Amino acid sequence: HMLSDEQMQIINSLVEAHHKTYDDSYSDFVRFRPPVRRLSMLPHLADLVSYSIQKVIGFAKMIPGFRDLTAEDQIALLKSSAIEIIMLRSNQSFSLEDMSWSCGGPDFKYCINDVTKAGHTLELLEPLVKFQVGLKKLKLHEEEHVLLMAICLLSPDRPGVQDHVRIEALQDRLCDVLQAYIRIQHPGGRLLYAKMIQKLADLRSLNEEHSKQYRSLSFQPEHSMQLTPLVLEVFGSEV
Amino acid sequence: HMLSDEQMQIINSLVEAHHKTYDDSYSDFVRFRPPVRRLSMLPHLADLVSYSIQKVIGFAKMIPGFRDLTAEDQIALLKSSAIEIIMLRSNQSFSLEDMSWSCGGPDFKYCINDVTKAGHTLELLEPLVKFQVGLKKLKLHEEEHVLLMAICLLSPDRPGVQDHVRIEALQDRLCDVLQAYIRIQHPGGRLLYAKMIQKLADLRSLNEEHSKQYRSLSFQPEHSMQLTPLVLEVFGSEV
């Protein structure tokens, strides 16, 4: 077999959207509040994350099918998946040598050290860093990566989804494009799809873990005041 | 006549509090989101202002008498007067030569040019800049300045004040300490008190003007998202 027009189209659509929402130069980082190497790295990281949410939203809008859902479902999907999509897209800048998120320069190289001073314990960072590596290893293709993100985001099983049938349809089409791609255009990728979907499962664990920690943070004004409106809104639990 | 113990005390209390809440080095500015010389100067200035609100709050807590009011009245007083107290304390860094707010370096020198790109029209900036100069000219003493701020903040005529009698008492004591000071320890200051109180009146006009403009801004998400939780909260109209 081989990918069809509609399928290649979907890939081009996604990959191009990813490009249009992922600045490989990391030039925008200078605009965030300076990283300070007691939650010293919270302001910068809060800005980095808020920035990421913005890109995630723009990426979504460009997923064929996402645009036609009810704002309620788009929001439902966003709020629920945002954090994971961010952990996913963040791997594209994760290094194995120094085991960190290198983003342009040394002042934007986040080591396990820095990442701590952001208000998050290792109960989160540990599984996250493991996810980052297990994923890095898969040495995916831009299309398998861009697809995995789209799939993840179009998961109907998120608290809030109304039309968990149309959202179910879209994702299945996406799941295929991937499954197919890994088949036709991906040599030595016989056990990949499995591992990839498996990653979506790891993300859920990380999602849950972050939610608890974040909830703990948001209840402390001296900290919540350090966040951004966008972050407070998306990560906040307002039905 | 001459100032009394209780009066000098109040001054020492205020002046020391001002010192403990006004960093003459402006070292904290490097922590704000970088100034970018379409509301380009909003992120930085929003951080500068949020930072200022924090100091204003700490200054307040140190005003003898403020600490014993009901949180509701303290909040009422803060939300209502904050903006003015900020415009007041900001003069302490206003220059006549370059007609700007110089704060440490050239990257923190806010010219009438910059100040525009913060989302505010000249209908505000104009009166503000005029206030800044008319005030600068008074060449006040640290004690007349620190006092004017305390007085301003302890104005009972603010929408929300419950006990507008105790707050009335405190301010009158403050109004005197000043009136007295300008008398005893201030040569050539015969028409000062009058002019000073007159300034409190100009502030009201600026307060009103800013409120309208800010209200306009806060209704635009693409802009409100640029603000800080603290600013949204204090400048926001939630009863």
């Binding site: 939203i57 788009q74 929001i75 966003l78 307002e238 | 635009q220 409100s224």
Partner: peptide, 11 residues
């Protein structure tokens, strides 16, 4: 709610 998300999500 979700003032921001809405704006960002609209064309």
């Amino acid at each position: 709610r979700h003032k921001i998300l809405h704006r960002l999500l609209q064309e």
